[PDB]
Every structure is written in structure tokens, then in C-alpha cells.
């Protein structure tokens, strides 16, 4: 290799990325996109794969640090932890009433 070489004789660094997928659990993913948290509005929330529709308000329930979601007696997610800032939010259903 000399620097006076023409193109096609110059050195080229090559990296070959081979993405292989065995049926072990996958641990290489892309950047999970996040958007600003909007409170006190009926929004569709997607928190760590748990999706739904609700109003996300501030909570007085103090979670233990390993716990992420909260359930009532009827096994419905009514409390959740925001992953960005470790705060507890009480999901409440977007309001329904008889007319």
C-alpha cells in the first residue's frame, strides 16, 4: 500500500454486520422512541409494552423500586410507573356516563 495508488488499489476497511436470530431471547434492538408525557388528558399510553387508553394523573401510591405496574382487585392496570422519571401515575378511564 502506497498513498500514490489509484482507486481500486487503495485500502478499504470493511465491516460485515451479520444479524443472526437464534430462538434465545433477543437482546439487540434499536433505540426505543419516547415522547413527552402529557397528563390530565385521555391519551393512549404505551409503557414498556403495556398499552391502553386513559387519563394519567399523579399518584400518592408509593411503589417498591422493582415494581412497575399496579392492579386493583379485578386485575386491571390502574397504576403505573413512568420509566423516564420514577413517578407513579394513576390511570383513570376516559370518562363515561349515561346521557
Amino acid at each position: 500500500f502506497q498513498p500514490t495508488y489509484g482507486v481500486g488499489y487503495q485500502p478499504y476497511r470493511v465491516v460485515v454486520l451479520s444479524f443472526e436470530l437464534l430462538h434465545a431471547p433477543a437482546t439487540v434492538c434499536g433505540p426505543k422512541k419516547s415522547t413527552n408525557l402529557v397528563k390530565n388528558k385521555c391519551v393512549n399510553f404505551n409503557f414498556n409494552g403495556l398499552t391502553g387508553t386513559g387519563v394519567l394523573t399523579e399518584s400518592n401510591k408509593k411503589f417498591l423500586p422493582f415494581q412497575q405496574f399496579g392492579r386493583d382487585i379485578a386485575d386491571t392496570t390502574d397504576a403505573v410507573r413512568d420509566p423516564q422519571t420514577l413517578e407513579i401515575l394513576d390511570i383513570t378511564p376516559c370518562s363515561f356516563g349515561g346521557v
Partner: antibody, heavy 117, light 108 residues
């Protein structure tokens, strides 16, 4: 010690077929780079084809799709099958051992292929 | 491809002289060049390879120089048996192309 002997050359009609043979001594053709190089009468040398040590075969643009270089390992012999011959293929053909299709230290004696009616 | 141009097409010098054969590539082919000697009615004989390195069994009067586009073959003392056609042959680019050839004539 190293000796390359071509055979099978002769007069052939246009559109005909011809199977050139190159027997070798002093090395095994199954583990060497072998080329066929032709020379038109009164003109310069022209590279026709090469076979690698692993078996990969390459041809020049004027001969691609018509000719077929091969070898037969258990007798130390190199062949060149020649199909659909045109008028410009009348030439002397040499089989040559190469150093990784770079340079040809050992050349065969050559055989003449004449293409006319 | 690469068009390999040899000069002169016919070279006539008295024996005992120094002969300089020039070969030119259309591209830059680095030091990927070989030289061959073809006697009349005889296969070509490899003289030098890698533009400088002599083949074993080739006498020391043959030498080579040059790089990139321009290359030279030097015969430091022309003798009687060197009446032949000399070819330069690049092997850097993908198609192996030979030169036009130079006929060397001894002036007796």
C-alpha cells in the same frame, strides 16, 4: 521437470466444437492455477481463460459463454472445451501455470486451432 | 479495460549495447507487471515479475524498473540469442491484458 503438452488442435468448421487437452508433468493441476492464452497469427497474446486452485473458472469477454475451461484431477489433465467458434478464434493456444493468475512462469508448447470452412 | 502500449514497435541495436523497452498502462497498475520473451516458433518465457524481480534461470543482464503507469525493461548487454518479441503484461486489474510486443533486432 515441469512440462505442459497440448493436444486436440486442428481444423474445425465455424460453429463447430473442439476439446483441447493439456497434460502436465512436474506438478498437479488440481492444486494449481491454470490459464489458456491465445495468440493470433502475426498478432500479440490474448488471455482466454483461467481456472483457480479451488476450481473457480473465469473467461475473457470475447470468449465468455462459449468456452469452458475444466480439469480432471485423477490423471493430472487440463481441458478447454470450445463451442460455437467464430472466424476470429483461429489462434495458437497455450496452457500456462500461473502464480495465482498473476504471471505465467511455465508455458505449454501450444496447439493451433484453425476455424474455416 | 487497461490498454497496454509498448514502445518502440521494432528496436534495432548492435550487440553489446543497452536496450530500454518502455511499457505504458492506461491506468496505474502499481508494480503488478510481468515481462515475457517469445522466440520465433517457441512459447513465451517469463523474464521478470512484480516489475523488478527476476525469474530464476534468467541471466543478470535483464532488469526492470518503473511503477504506476511507466515501466522499463533494460537489457544491459545485447547478445545474439535475444532476437525475440518482448511483452509487458499487467495483472492488477481484473482482465489480464498483454502489450503489443516489441521485436528486438541485432545489428550485425
Amino acid at each position: 521437470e515441469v512440462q505442459l503438452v497440448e493436444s486436440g488442435g486442428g481444423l474445425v468448421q465455424p460453429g463447430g466444437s473442439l476439446r483441447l487437452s493439456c497434460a502436465a508433468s512436474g506438478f498437479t493441476v488440481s492444486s494449481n492455477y491454470m490459464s489458456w492464452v491465445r495468440q493470433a497469427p502475426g498478432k500479440g497474446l490474448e488471455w482466454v481463460s483461467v481456472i483457480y486452485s479451488g476450481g473457480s473458472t473465469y473467461y475473457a469477454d470475447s470468449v465468455k459463454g462459449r468456452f469452458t475451461i475444466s480439469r480432471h484431477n485423477s490423471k493430472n489433465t487440463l481441458y478447454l472445451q470450445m463451442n460455437s467458434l467464430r472466424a476470429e478464434d483461429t489462434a495458437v493456444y497455450y496452457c500456462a501455470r500461473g502464480y495465482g493468475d498473476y504471471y505465467f512462469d511455465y508455458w505449454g508448447q501450444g496447439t493451433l486451432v484453425t476455424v474455416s470452412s | 479495460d487497461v490498454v497496454m502500449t509498448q514502445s518502440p514497435a521494432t528496436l534495432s541495436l548492435s550487440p553489446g549495447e543497452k536496450a530500454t523497452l518502455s511499457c505504458r498502462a492506461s491506468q496505474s497498475v502499481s508494480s503488478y507487471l510481468a515481462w515475457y520473451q517469445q522466440k520465433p516458433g517457441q512459447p513465451p518465457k517469463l523474464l521478470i515479475y512484480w516489475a523488478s524481480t527476476r525469474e530464476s534461470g534468467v541471466p543478470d543482464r535483464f532488469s526492470g524498473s518503473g511503477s504506476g503507469t511507466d515501466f522499463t525493461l533494460t537489457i544491459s548487454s545485447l547478445q545474439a540469442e535475444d532476437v525475440a518479441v518482448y511483452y509487458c503484461q499487467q495483472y492488477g486489474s481484473s482482465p489480464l491484458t498483454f502489450g503489443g510486443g516489441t521485436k528486438v533486432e541485432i545489428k550485425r
